[PDB]
Structures are given as structure tokens and as C-alpha cells.
Design a protein around this ligand. Structure first.
Ligand SMILES: O=c1ccn([C@@H]2O[C@H](COP(=O)(O)OP(=O)(O)O)[C@@H](O)[C@H]2O)c(=O)[nH]1
Ligand SMILES: *[C@@H]1O[C@H](CO)[C@@H](O)[C@H](O)[C@H]1O
Ligand SMILES: O=C(O)c1ccccc1O
Length: 442
């Protein structure tokens, strides 16, 4: 058995795809990971497991996404160039020790099924977003692109709870058509994989599994932090942002008392405005903080803000070893844009969050953080503008550090570590679902 693994070319999709492959290798399955050449020349390959990489093309080997004329051009070029480049990996390996038997492609790339079917291969999409989010999208697809509020099977959800495509009308029309066209052919899939575990959205997994065979194979957080069954899986080893020489960071955090630091980070792709950046900077400077401002975003922090940094309470970085930060006892709360990987990381580490979602599926994750998992609070935004003002930010941070919702939320969230380990340990639902997939593949 041999699996070709095709992530969407961003950090948030690549690392679950890699981590999943480490589990496949642990279970005796050969995997080749298909990176775009733009990405492959942007990686800095320090590994934490055996890795086999094949290169494919999205049609932007030189400049990547930012050189495309439009988002919708990128997707269609990606389909054309990606279909050819993926086919060639399959062809080339046919006469080899292990010809490929299964394509595990990102759900954002449904055309990979066509390629998988043309070579008689097993095909399974891989959803990097939670069951709740995708079931919402699925219900729109079997509709014709909009949704019945309230959702009869999940009626506690409102307009501000939905993905940004619904509440910001007309925004990202091409990206909106992508998340819906995840379902154009998923019927024909041999299985459907989602980077979640059953006990985290037990309800919403059921709803979605009525329509399609869903196999939860998360969480994709490295084995060392949970189940420890995979000795080599110590961290995230395919990173698009250079690694700071990260022990400066983790040494600084063992300097500070337990639960004293506020961690701030917005993922790999989210861009705030100048206005957004000073409201944050003021609210956060009321605290001992660790803030990740990526390099493309230093522009928009206040004039001379990085000088005014109190070096005895707080620190600003271009990027961070987020896994090790969230495992560090000096963190008190995590101010997060609610990217799915970041949310599952904070839940697994028992770090309560201040949710400050920005777009696509982050509003849903923020609702579940506050009202389903009761593991954090959503910051309030002025409705004219969608911007969180410095005092609404500071209010929310204090509610998770000092309020006494704060020690209730503190204990509600520590439930999840042990649930996640149980699913990754022998006989867990995730460990069982991975075995069903491995069974099919050979
Ligand atoms: O400074 C940082 C910020 C983020 N991350 C990692 O980058 C991923 C971010 O993906 P996520 O799903 O949170 O959001 P997206 O980045 O896709 O918008 C997560 O695994 C984080 O652990 C990191 O390692 N250092
Ligand atoms: C879409 O817009 C969000 C905020 O609205 C920004 O974070 C992204 O960079 C952009 O693609
Ligand atoms: O990379 C992501 O996380 C993503 C998620 C939803 C829609 C578009 C995207 O690029």
C-alpha cells in the first residue's frame, strides 16, 4: 500500500497532511507527500520523521499565489497544472517497488478524485476543518448555495456564528465557491477524512455521517504531546516561516510565573489593518504578553511600538513554536484568530482562549469555543466596523485570566487532552478509523 497525499499549499493544510502521514507510516503505510514546487523551495527541510516528497505545480512556481491575477485564476490554473503534475507522479511510480494505490487529496481540490479514478486509485478527500463547519457547507450545497436559518438540526446557531461568506455578503466569491464545491463529487469518494476526533463534536459528526461516510482521524497534533505511540513525532516539521531558532522563546517563558503570559497569534495567513493593530497593541500592553506579528505585518504596528515593548514583561516575534508555547505553563490565555489547527491545539493543551475571529470558518470555531466547549470568550466587535476596540479586547482577556468564569473555563477545557489521547491510543475512535482506512488501502 502507498498513499499520495496532496495538501492545499498553505501551512494550515500542510501540517495536518504531514502529521496524518506520520500516523500512516507508524501503521505500516507508505506515503508520498505532494508539495507544489513553490512551497518545496520555501520549506527548510529539518525533519522529525522519514519523509518522501514529490513535487507538483499549481502554475506559480516562482511567485506563488501573490503573483496570480485573481483568486479564481489561481484555482483554475491549479486544477490544470495540478492534474498534470499529479498524474505524472502516479505514472512514474507504476513501475517501481511500490506503485501508488490511493490519493488522499485536500477537500479544497475535488478534481484530484478525477485523477485518482483515471488510474484506478482509491480516493479520499481530507477536510482540515471541523465537522460542524463542513456540515453547514454541505447543507448549502444540497441546497443551491445558501442556508436555512435556523438550521433545524443545530438551532443554537445565528448569523454571526456562520462562516464569513454568509455574514459578509459578496466577500471572497471564488473562495466561497471552493468550500461549497468540496461536495460536488465527494459521493464517489471511498472515504471522507476529517482532522477531528469523535468526542469533540459528537453530535455534528453524527449529522454529517448520515450523508456520507466520515472518518475522524484527528487531532493531528504530534504524538509526543498526546499518545506518545510514535516516538519520532516530536513536532511540526514542514514550516513555511523560518523557525527563529525558537529556544530563545521557550527559555523566556520559563522565566515567567505560571499562567502569567497572554499568547497572541493569528495563524499564517490573516492580515489585520493599521487600525486593528493599534487597538490590539494598546489592549495587549496592559499585560505580560507574547505576541506573534509576522514579518509582512510589522508595517502596520504603531510608529515606534516595538521600541516601547517592556522587555521585562513581554516579547514580540515573527513566528513561534506554537506547539511548545501552548504546552508551557506560563501561558494564561491564548488570544486567537480561531484557525482550526490553533483551536484544537489550545483545547488539547487546556489553554483557555480569547476568540477574535477574522474570516472563513473562524466565526464557527469561536462560537464553539465560547458556548459549546465553554473554553473561552469571543471578543465583542463594534457592528459598524467589525473591529474589536482596545477595551473590548482587554475586557475579554481579563475575563479569561481574572474573572471566575475564568476558573470554570479553566477546568472545562482540561477535559479534552485526555479525550484526545484516548482516541489516539489503541482502541480509540481515531485509532480505529485510521485502521479502517489502512485496511482499504492494502
Ligand atoms: O506563530 C505561529 C502562529 C501559528 N503557528 C502554527 O501555525 C498553524 C496555524 O494554522 P491555523 O489552522 O491555526 O490557521 P491558518 O494559519 O490556517 O489561518 C497552527 O498549527 C499553529 O500551531 C506556529 O507554529 N507559529
Ligand atoms: C481576507 O480578509 C481577512 C479579514 O477580513 C484577512 O485576514 C485575509 O488576509 C484576507 O484574505
Ligand atoms: O487555508 C485555509 O485555512 C482556508 C480555509 C478556508 C478557505 C480558504 C482558505 O485558504
Amino acid at each position: 500500500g502507498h498513499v499520495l497525499a496532496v495538501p492545499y499549499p498553505t501551512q494550515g493544510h500542510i501540517t495536518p497532511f504531514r502529521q496524518f502521514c506520520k500516523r500512516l507510516h507508524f501503521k505500516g503505510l507508505k506515503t508520498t507527500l505532494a508539495l507544489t514546487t513553490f512551497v518545496f523551495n520555501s520549506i527548510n527541510p529539518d525533519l522529525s520523521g522519514p519523509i518522501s516528497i514529490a513535487t507538483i505545480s499549481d502554475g506559480y512556481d516562482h511567485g506563488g499565489f501573490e503573483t496570480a491575477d485573481s483568486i479564481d485564476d489561481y484555482l483554475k490554473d491549479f486544477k490544470t497544472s495540478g492534474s498534470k503534475t499529479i498524474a505524472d507522479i502516479i505514472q512514474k511510480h507504476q513501475t517501481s517497488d511500490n506503485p501508488i494505490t490511493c490519493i488522499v487529496y485536500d477537500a479544497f481540490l475535488p478534481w484530484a478524485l478525477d485523477v485518482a479514478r483515471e488510474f484506478g486509485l482509491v480516493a479520499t478527500p481530507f477536510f482540515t476543518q471541523p465537522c460542524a463547519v463542513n456540515y453547514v457547507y454541505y447543507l448549502s450545497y444540497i441546497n443551491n448555495g445558501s442556508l436555512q436559518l435556523p438550521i433545524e438540526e443545530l438551532p443554537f446557531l445565528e448569523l454571526q456564528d456562520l462562516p464569513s461568506f454568509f455574514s459578509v455578503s459578496g466577500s471572497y466569491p471564488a473562495y466561497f465557491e471552493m468550500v461549497l464545491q468540496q461536495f460536488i463529487n465527494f459521493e464517489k469518494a471511498d472515504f471522507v477524512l476529517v482532522n477531528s476526533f469523535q468526542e469533540l463534536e459528537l453530535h455534528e459528526n453524527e449529522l454529517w455521517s448520515k450523508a456520507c461516510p466520515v472518518l475522524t482521524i484527528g487531532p493531528t497534533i504530534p504524538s509526543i504531546y498526546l499518545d506518545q505511540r510514535i516516538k519520532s513525532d516530536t513536532g511540526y516539521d514542514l514550516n513555511l516561516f523560518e523557525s527563529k531558532d525558537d529556544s530563545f522563546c521557550i527559555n523566556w517563558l520559563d522565566t515567567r510565573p505560571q499562567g502569567s503570559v497572554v499568547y497572541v497569534a493569528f495563524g499564517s495567513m490573516a492580515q489585520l489593518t493599521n487600525v486593528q493593530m493599534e487597538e490590539l497593541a494598546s489592549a495587549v500592553s496592559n499585560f505580560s504578553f507574547l505576541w506573534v506579528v509576522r514579518s509582512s505585518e510589522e508595517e502596520k504596528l504603531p510608529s515606534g511600538f516595538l521600541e516601547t515593548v517592556n522587555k521585562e514583561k513581554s516579547l514580540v516575534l515573527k513566528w513561534s513554536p506554537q506547539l511548545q508555547v501552548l504546552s508551557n505553563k506560563a501561558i494564561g490565555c491564548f488570544l486567537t484568530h480561531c484557525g482550526w489547527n490553533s483551536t484544537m491545539e489550545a483545547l488539547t493543551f487546556g489553554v483557555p482562549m480569547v476568540a477574535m475571529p477574522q474570516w472563513t470558518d473562524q466565526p464557527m470555531n469561536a462560537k464553539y469555543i465560547q458556548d459549546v466547549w465553554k473554553a473561552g470568550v469571543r471578543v465583542k466587535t463594534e457592528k459598524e466596523s467589525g473591529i474589536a476596540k482596545r477595551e473590548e479586547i482587554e475586557f475579554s482577556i481579563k475575563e479569561v485570566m481574572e474573572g471566575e468564569r475564568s476558573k470554570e473555563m479553566k477546568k472545562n477545557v482540561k477535559k479534552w487532552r485526555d479525550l484526545a489521547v484516548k482516541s489516539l491510543n489503541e482502541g480509540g475512535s481515531t485509532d480505529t478509523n485510521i485502521d479502517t482506512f489502512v485496511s482499504r488501502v492494502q
